[PDB]
Design a protein around this ligand. Structure first.
Ligand SMILES: CCCCCCCCCCCCCC
Ligand SMILES: CCCCCCCCCCCCCC
Ligand SMILES: CCCCCCCCCC
Ligand SMILES: CCCCCCCCCC
Ligand SMILES: CCCCCCCCCC
Ligand SMILES: CCCCCCCC
Ligand SMILES: CCCCCCCC
Ligand SMILES: CCCCCCCC
Ligand SMILES: CCCCCCCC
Ligand SMILES: CCCCCCCC
Lengths: 80, 316, 160
């Protein structure tokens, strides 16, 4: 399946971060840090590059909080 | 544009089901869906007010909501509505731009004096649905039609009324306190199921008429009289048996006229039969034979001429 | 009688104080004056009476406006045919004394006579003729049998 676009916005839609395509172009990653007292985040994944009816494309999404080793987690999903 | 302009409204309507028709009172009832869309920066909005991208109002009319936010909105009405309207899934929702839209699923009864049943059962009618804006044309105007569904939707099984074609149109009409308002009209052209009436009424009638026609070949005039008398009672019995498919409107249709003519001819058969019996009694059998030949030639010509006359005077 | 259904109800006013009211209505009205003795040849009046709810020294109907045709035309036939109409202002006694204004519209109506004539009277006449003609016969058994059959035919038509 073709690589979709990734971005991060708050609850109102204000953009905060955008996804970077790695040199081994098989994944897209994102990173952010908290400054405000309370931050509510929304993760956007979209593949509407054009109007192609590709069909049943399926992707794997991995997310983590205070987990910089997301590339090689090894442990099963912990915490919450 | 130095001159401040008007607001443009997009509108759409779809019919799910015709649920009834009152031919005496002249009204019909219908189930359907209504959709309105427009854009107004005074409805603008800042997301940090709620942390949200969509503001909405539920189970309220456009008039009610206008009275809460104290800004003018495109309120409407159904022009021919009789009594109250049942509504479901009623909602208004708005974006930070001010792009707004309204949705309703409705069941409503509409007056229709344009109905005309003279040609019954061969009659054809129009079911028209009219939506009027309740505000002047310089404030809001219907500008575009949206086809969000099939305008008339399909349903399993048969229907009493068959839609032959439809259309949808925007016009403008005069308004109280002057000026003009926009109108959106949907019209369905409809006819009845003809096979039902044909097979249920006309073939048995034709056989009954044939029964009174064929008896004139007999030369025993007592048997002819008795069979004529019995056939008249059979005719009356069948007429009151089909009386359920005979609407009581207070004026004559094609079918009532045909029934009256048939009854009159059936009774004249009995009268001629009594005359021929007397003639045979007195010993003038030749005159009775000649009357038999005349009746056998004449009666189908009379029926055919009456049918031609009815066709000329009611269908052209 | 009971509630009234109303549409397009509005009041509007100008800086002078010139004001006006509009309503589209559907309403059911009691009418004991009806008299059906002559049916179907009967004739009736449909009268609509509008009364002011305030004393005549406060407000009084003073002029009649013909903003449309008083009785409007419609496609197809009607059961009741309007032969003539009229409209009039009068004054009538009021609770807590004095008097109030009244505006009356009356329609004079008749039935569609051809319907009843063709549907009832001609077949009746033929049935009566059938029982009349049989007395020319001299075979009284046939006459008896035909009379007996014609009576049943008459009853069948009556209940039809
Ligand atoms: C009236 C019912 C229809 C019966 C068919 C009539 C067809 C015309 C035939 C004419 C025959 C005349 C023979 C003397
Ligand atoms: C009763 C049904 C009407 C039939 C017509 C009667 C007309 C009067 C004719 C009188 C004839 C008397 C012959 C002895
Ligand atoms: C109203 C029908 C009149 C029919 C008269 C019949 C004359 C028969 C005498 C033999
Ligand atoms: C259903 C109507 C039938 C009427 C009589 C037909 C007579 C035809 C003679 C040719
Ligand atoms: C459109 C069909 C025309 C009908 C003309 C004949 C009617 C006969 C009397 C029922
Ligand atoms: C509903 C069928 C239309 C008319 C068909 C004629 C067949 C008798
Ligand atoms: C066999 C019955 C013929 C009926 C013809 C009249 C209806 C069109
Ligand atoms: C138009 C209805 C006429 C009724 C009687 C006809 C007798 C042949
Ligand atoms: C509705 C018609 C009035 C009476 C006409 C008489 C014709 C039989
Ligand atoms: C006025 C109705 C009675 C006359 C009927 C004559 C039938 C041909």
């Amino acid at each position: 399946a073709p690589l979709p676009r990734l971005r991060l916005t708050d609850s109102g839609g204000k953009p905060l971060a955008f996804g970077l395509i790695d040199q081994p172009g098989e994944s897209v990653e994102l990173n952010y840090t908290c400054d405000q007292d309370i931050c509510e985040l929304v993760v956007h994944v979209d593949g509407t590059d054009g109007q192609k009816d590709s069909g049943e494309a399926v992707y794997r999404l991995l997310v983590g909080i205070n987990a910089p080793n997301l590339r090689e987690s090894g442990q099963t999903p912990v915490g919450s | 544009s130095v001159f401040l302009e008007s607001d443009l409204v997009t509108v759409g309507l779809a019919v799910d089901q015709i649920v009834g028709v009152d031919q005496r009172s002249e009204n019909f009832s219908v189930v359907g869906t209504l959709k309105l869309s427009w854009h107004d920066p005074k409805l603008g909005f800042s997301p940090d007010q709620c942390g949200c991208t969509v503001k909405s109002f539920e189970d309220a009319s456009i008039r009610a909501v206008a009275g809460e936010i104290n800004l003018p909105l495109p309120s409407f009405s159904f022009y021919n509505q009789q009594g109250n309207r049942w509504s479901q899934n009623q909602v208004i929702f708005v974006t930070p731009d001010g792009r707004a839209s309204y949705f309703e699923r409705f069941t409503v009864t509409l007056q229709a004096p344009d109905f005309d049943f003279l040609a019954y059962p061969f009659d054809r009618q129009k079911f028209s649905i009219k939506v009027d804006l309740a505000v002047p044309t310089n404030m809001f105007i219907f500008n575009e039609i949206e086809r969000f569904q099939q305008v008339v939707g399909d349903q399993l099984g048969e229907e009493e009324w068959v839609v032959t074609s439809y259309s949808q149109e925007i016009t403008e009409v005069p308004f109280e306190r002057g000026s003009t308002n926009s109108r959106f009209t949907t019209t369905l052209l409809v006819k009845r199921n003809l096979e039902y009436y044909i097979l249920r009424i006309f073939v048995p009638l034709f056989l009954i008429i044939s029964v009174s026609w064929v008896i004139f070949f007999l030369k025993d005039y007592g048997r002819q009289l008795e069979v004529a008398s019995g056939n008249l009672l059979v005719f009356v019995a069948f007429n009151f048996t089909i009386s359920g498919d005979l609407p009581r409107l207070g004026y004559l249709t094609v079918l009532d006229r045909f029934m009256i003519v048939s009854f009159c001819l059936t009774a004249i058969v009995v009268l001629i039969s009594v005359c021929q019996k007397r003639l045979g009694a007195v010993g003038k059998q030749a005159v009775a034979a000649q009357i038999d030949t005349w009746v056998l030639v004449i009666y189908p010509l009379v029926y055919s001429l009456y049918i031609i006359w009815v066709y000329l005077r009611f269908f052209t």
